[PDB]
Structures are given as structure tokens and as C-alpha cells.
Amino acid sequence: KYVDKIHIGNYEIDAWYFSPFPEDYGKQPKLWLCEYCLKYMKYEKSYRFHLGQCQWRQPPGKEIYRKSNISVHEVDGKDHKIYCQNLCLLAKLFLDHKTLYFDVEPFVFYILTEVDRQGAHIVGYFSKEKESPDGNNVSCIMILPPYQRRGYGRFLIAFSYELSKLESTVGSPEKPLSDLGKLSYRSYWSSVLLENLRDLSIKDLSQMTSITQNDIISTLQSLNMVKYWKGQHVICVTPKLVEEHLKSAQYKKPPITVDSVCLKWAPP
Numbered sequence: 001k002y003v004d005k006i007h008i009g010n011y012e013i014d015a016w017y018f019s020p021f022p023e024d025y026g027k028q029p030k031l032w033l034c035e036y037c038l039k040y041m042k043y044e045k046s047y048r049f050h051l052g053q054c055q056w057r058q059p060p061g062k063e064i065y066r067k068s069n070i071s072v073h074e075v076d077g078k079d080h081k082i083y084c085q086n087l088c089l090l091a092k093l094f095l096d097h098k099t100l101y102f103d104v105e106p107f108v109f110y111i112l113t114e115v116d117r118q119g120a121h122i123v124g125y126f127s128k129e130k131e132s133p134d135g136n137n138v139s140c141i142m143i144l145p146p147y148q149r150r151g152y153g154r155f156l157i158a159f160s161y162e163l164s165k166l167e168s169t170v171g172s173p174e175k176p177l178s179d180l181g182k183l184s185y186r187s188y189w190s191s192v193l194l195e196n197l198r199d200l201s202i203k204d205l206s207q208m209t210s211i212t213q214n215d216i217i218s219t220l221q222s223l224n225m226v227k228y229w230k231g232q233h234v235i236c237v238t239p240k241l242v243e244e245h246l247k248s249a250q251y252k253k254p255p256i257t258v259d260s261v262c263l264k265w266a267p268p
């Protein structure tokens with residue numbers, strides 16, 4: 001038997017995928033997780049006891065973004081191994097393709113939290129290779145189900161690219177993306193490129209956004225905004241065409257914006 005259900009904070013969440021918690025934890029009807037330190041437990045009574053003991057009220061690591069009650073913590077996999085392993089086991093319940101859970105030292109993790117009087121409540125995260133040979137600015141990205149489709153994933157996507165900008169690099173998420181991940185990246189890419197075209201070569205879009213040229217091209221193709229001329233993709237759009245796409249109901253929900261002013265982060 002696998003873990004099929006978790007209790008975290010005030011949520012109960014059904015699993016989507018196998019995650020390799022120890023055998024004796026899977027056998028339980030439900031796993032209970034401290035929303036702050038991510039310790040996983042077998043019983044409600046040990047969970048209730050931990051809640052009265054645990055002194056964490058937010059992720060470890062450094063708070064590298066705070067605007068109002070939205071917060072991002074940077075956590076080095078080498079400085080906080082247990083926490084990051086628990087995070088990976090949690091994430092694997094909702095990620096089909098994640099394969100790495102216990103070798104966390106090559107990764108840094110960016111934890112998104114929503115804050116209230118009681119603490120910084122975990123919403124999702126993305127991991128990132130400290131050294132990405134293939135130029136990936138995201139390794140795995142996960143939003144817990146009760147927060148999906150609510151602007152948090154778009155926030156984390158925009159956040160990964162702001163880091164890429166500060167590093168003077170382009171980056172792409174490591175593939176394969178989940179189904180929701182695909183739609184989310186395509187929608188974010190479209191929003192960003194359509195906004196830049198409203199107020200430019202493909203290379204300039206890539207340098208202004210840190211989106212790779214391939215991701216730009218494939219998005220402009222899906223928008224039918226590129227011409228081909230002698231082996232070269234070339235942007236072919238009328239400012240009115242841009243505006244028509246932006247008025248569509250795709251880009252109608254007001255984002256949680258990433259305010260670069262509130263991002264306290266220098267490149268490694």
C-alpha cells in the first residue's frame with residue numbers, strides 16, 4: 001500500500017502518484033505533515049503533539065522575497081537536507097516525472113508561502129540545479145492542489161525568470177512538464193510576449209524576458225505571429241492583432257505580480 005492521502009495544515013489532500021515514503025508510512029491510511037518543518041507522521045496523536053512542540057512558523061533558509069503576505073524562501077539542499085527531502089517526497093505525490101528525492105544537495109529550493117497571523121503557509125515550490133548544464137532555470141515546479149489555478153503557479157513561473165534575468169541568462173523548465181505545467185507555461189509565455197509586443201526581434205524578446213528563443217518561437221507559432229524567411233523565424237504581427245489576443249479571457253485574471261523591488265537576491 002502507498003500513501004494515498006495527506007493532512008497538512010488545515011487541508012486534506014488525495015495523492016496523485018506514488019511517492020517513496022518508507023514502507024511503514026505508506027501502510028497508514030493517512031500521512032500527517034507539519035506545514036512548517038514538513039516532518040511527516042503516522043498518527044493524528046503524534047501530529048497533534050508535534051504541533052504543540054514545533055517552533056517553526058515558516059520555511060528555513062533565507063526569505064528572498066516579501067511583498068505584503070506573499071513570501072519566497074531560498075533553501076539550499078546542502079544546508080537543510082532533511083527539510084528538502086521531506087519537500088521532495090511531498091512534491092512527488094503530485095508530480096509524475098520527478099525522480100530525485102534524497103539527493104538534494106545539488107539543488108536549491110524556492111518555497112512560496114502565504115502569510116497570516118499564525119505563520120507562513122506553504123503553497124508550492126520549485127527546485128533549481130545549482131549547476132544546470134542544459135540551461136534549465138527550473139527543475140521541478142509544484143503547486144499543492146488546493147492552490148492550483150489560482151495565480152500561484154504563474155507567480156512562481158515569473159519568479160524563476162526574474163532569477164534568470166538577474167543571472168543575465170535565458171532559461172527553460174526541465175521537461176517533461178505535467179499537463180497543468182504545460183498549459184501554465186504556455187499561458188505565461190503568451191502573456192509576457194504579447195505584453196512586450198504591445199508596448200523587436202526574437203533575440204530581443206529573449207534578452208528582455210530570459211525566455212529561450214525556442215520557447216519564444218514555439219509560442220509565437222501557436223499564436224500564428226511568426227513568418228519564416230529563408231531558414232529564419234521572423235516576427236510578423238500587427239499591434240491590433242496583439243491587442244485582440246490580450247483582450248481574450250485567457251489573460252483576464254489579475255496576477256499576483258512579482259515586484260522586482262521586493263526581490264532581495266544577488267546571483268551566485
Ligand SMILES: Cc1cc(-n2nccn2)cc(C(=O)NNS(=O)(=O)c2ccccc2)c1F
Nearest residue numbers: 142143148149150151152153154181184187
Ligand atoms: C507550472 C505549474 C505546475 C503546477 N503543478 N504541477 C504539478 C502540480 N502542480 C501547477 C501550476 C498552477 O497552479 N497553474 N495555475 S495558475 O497559477 O493559475 C497560472 C495561470 C496563468 C499562467 C500560468 C499559471 C503551475 F503553474
Ligand code: NA
Nearest residue numbers: 012013014145
Ligand atoms: Na484532494
Ligand SMILES: [Zn+2]
Nearest residue numbers: 034036037054
Ligand atoms: Zn514541525
